Amino acid sequence: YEHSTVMPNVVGFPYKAHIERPGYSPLTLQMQVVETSLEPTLNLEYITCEYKTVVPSPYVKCCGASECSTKEKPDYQCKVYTGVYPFMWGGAYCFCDSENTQLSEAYVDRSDVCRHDHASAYKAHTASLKAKVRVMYGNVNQTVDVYVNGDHAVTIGGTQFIFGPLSSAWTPFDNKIVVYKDEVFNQDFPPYGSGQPGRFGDIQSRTVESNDLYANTALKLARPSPGMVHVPYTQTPSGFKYWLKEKGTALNTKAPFGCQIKTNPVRAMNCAVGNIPVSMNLPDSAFTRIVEAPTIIDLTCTVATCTHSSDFGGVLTLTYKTDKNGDCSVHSHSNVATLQEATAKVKTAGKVTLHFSTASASPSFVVSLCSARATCSASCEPPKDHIVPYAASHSNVVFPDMSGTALSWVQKISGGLGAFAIGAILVLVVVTCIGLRR
Amino acid sequence: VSAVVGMSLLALISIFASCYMLVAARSKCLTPYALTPGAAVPWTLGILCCAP
Ligand SMILES: *[C@@H]1O[C@H](CO)[C@@H](O[C@@H]2O[C@H](CO)[C@@H](O)[C@H](O)[C@H]2NC(C)=O)[C@H](O)[C@H]1NC(C)=O
Numbered sequence: 225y226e227h228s229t230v231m232p233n234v235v236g237f238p239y240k241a242h243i244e245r246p247g248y249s250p251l252t253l254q255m256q257v258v259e260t261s262l263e264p265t266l267n268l269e270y271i272t273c274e275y276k277t278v279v280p281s282p283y284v285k286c287c288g289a290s291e292c293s294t295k296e297k298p299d300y301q302c303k304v305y306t307g308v309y310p311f312m313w314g315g316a317y318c319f320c321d322s323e324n325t326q327l328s329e330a331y332v333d334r335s336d337v338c339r340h341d342h343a344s345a346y347k348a349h350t351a352s353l354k355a356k357v358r359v360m361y362g363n364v365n366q367t368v369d370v371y372v373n374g375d376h377a378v379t380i381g382g383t384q385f386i387f388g389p390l391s392s393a394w395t396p397f398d399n400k401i402v403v404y405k406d407e408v409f410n411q412d413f414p415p416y417g418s419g420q421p422g423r424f425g426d427i428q429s430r431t432v433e434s435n436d437l438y439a440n441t442a443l444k445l446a447r448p449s450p451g452m453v454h455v456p457y458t459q460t461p462s463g464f465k466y467w468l469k470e471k472g473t474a475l476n477t478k479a480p481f482g483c484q485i486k487t488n489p490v491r492a493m494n495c496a497v498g499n500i501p502v503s504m505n506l507p508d509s510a511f512t513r514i515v516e517a518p519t520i521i522d523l524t525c526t527v528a529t530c531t532h533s534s535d536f537g538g539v540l541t542l543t544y545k546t547d548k549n550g551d552c553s554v555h556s557h558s559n560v561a562t563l564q565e566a567t568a569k570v571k572t573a574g575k576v577t578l579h580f581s582t583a584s585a586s587p588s589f590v591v592s593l594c595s596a597r598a599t600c601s602a603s604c605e606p607p608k609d610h611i612v613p614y615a616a617s618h619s620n621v622v623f624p625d626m627s628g629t630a631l632s633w634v635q636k637i638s639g640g641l642g643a644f645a646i647g648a649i650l651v652l653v654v655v656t657c658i659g660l661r662r
Numbered sequence: 663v664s665a666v667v668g669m670s671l672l673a674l675i676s677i678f679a680s681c682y683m684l685v686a687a688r689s690k691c692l693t694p695y696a697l698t699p700g701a702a703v704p705w706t707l708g709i710l711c712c713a714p
Pocket residue numbers: 287288319320323
């Protein structure tokens with residue numbers, strides 16, 4: 225036997241599924257979503273870290289001149305300065321008063337910590353969903369891990385389940401994201417090979433272990449002050465620290481729909497969006513035949529108290545007449561009110577108590593105890609507490625039933641006005657028929 | 663607020679239309695008697711409608 229239903233993708237909300245086939249008693253399914261995960265597929269672009277500058281000891285030549293040649297190193301800058309008279313702690317360094325020269329050079333290489341402290345640049349693509357759903361029926365209570373893509377098919381006590389695909393393709397990640405430690409950001413980054421000094425991405429490496437590097441830090445040399453040995457240089461500070469100071473606000477404290485964001489791997493958890501469809505194929509061993517099921521006749525419903533709150537603020541009592549003791553299945557056929565229990569014990573006394581929740585001033589719904597049905601109508605009063613710590617256990621419906629007090633008054637007013645209009649129309653038509661007869 | 667405004671407006675226009683059409687029915691029933699020279703409206707019709 226095949227079946228199909230949809231469930232709301234909200235974590236913790238109990239969902240009762242009613243199945244009914246000729247020749248068997250109805251059966252009630254309960255499925256609950258424990259946790260969900262949304263994972264995007266990422267391709268790395270580049271990484272960044274703090275840099276270091278290696279300045280070797282300068283070369284000073286007495287009574288001679290030197291020229292320096294270019295090398296293939298990141299931001300290699302070499303200059304030769306003429307007419308220098310170095311001094312040391314003992315005295316002068318060379319005889320030649322003004323026939324000396326000095327060679328100074330420097331370059332930039334990645335820090336010895338890039339392996340431990342780096343920020344990655346990614347590019348987010350279409351994302352997949354994974355779920356952990358608990359099913360419960362008869363005498364089965366297990367939880368399974370499923371892929372919500374329409375492809376997975378898991379078996380639970382001899383029943384096939386196929387989930388998904390989700391009704392909405394919504395992802396909090398933008399096309400380009402940056403991941404650092406425990407946070408993610410929706411910021412664009414400069415393309416590879418075109419970084420700018422003092423900002424994010426001034427030092428770029430294709431991967432952690434790559435041997436190539438792109439650095440653009442505006443390294444400029446300066447002529448040494450007279451009578452001193454030193455290499456001076458002016459360099460724009462590291463852009464990675466600058467970004468780390470006022471990077472902005474993280475996605476962890478901005479993500480909509482109450483989504484918890486974790487990293488390693490980059491994923492979003494418990495996103496409350498859309499509704500998932502469920503397809504199932506139940507075997508004939510999970511049902512019970514109509515012969516061995518109690519017969520219920522003359523079923524009527526009444527409501528004792530009703531307070532539309534996020535809790536189970538409602539108690540309803542069913543009276544009936546049966547022929548043998550047993551257990552049935554209960555279910556509410558409208559999304560206005562959601563029951564708490566799915567199976568109830570019936571006996572010869574003829575009274576059962578049920579708990580339900582609602583969010584409407586006057587709810588009207590049809591309950592079903594085994595094969596019998598009845599109708600319930602109630603009047604509820606609003607609660608007094610303003611703030612509660614638990615989530616709502618009712619589908620958000622506020623439109624009252626047509627027989628409620630407000631709609632009753634509107635019906636009476638409309639009926640009176642319509643009666644007046646109809647009487648006026650009849651009077652005019654009679655008068656005009658008489659007039660035309662003349 | 664919007665629903666109350668709309669309901670009140672609909673009730674008002676319904677009442678006005680009914681009253682106007684009933685007045686028109688009166689005026690069309692009693693129009694020929696004002697054109698006939700002499701004569702007089704019957705007392706019954708002159709009671710169930712105000713006849714000058
Ligand atoms: C020793 O010092 C003398 C100078 O006191 C050096 O002679 C100079 O050599 C350079 C290079 O040919 C010339 O341009 C200068 O004109 C020379 N100076 C004089 C005063 O003639 C000499 O090279 C030094 N030798 C060593 C081994 O240090």
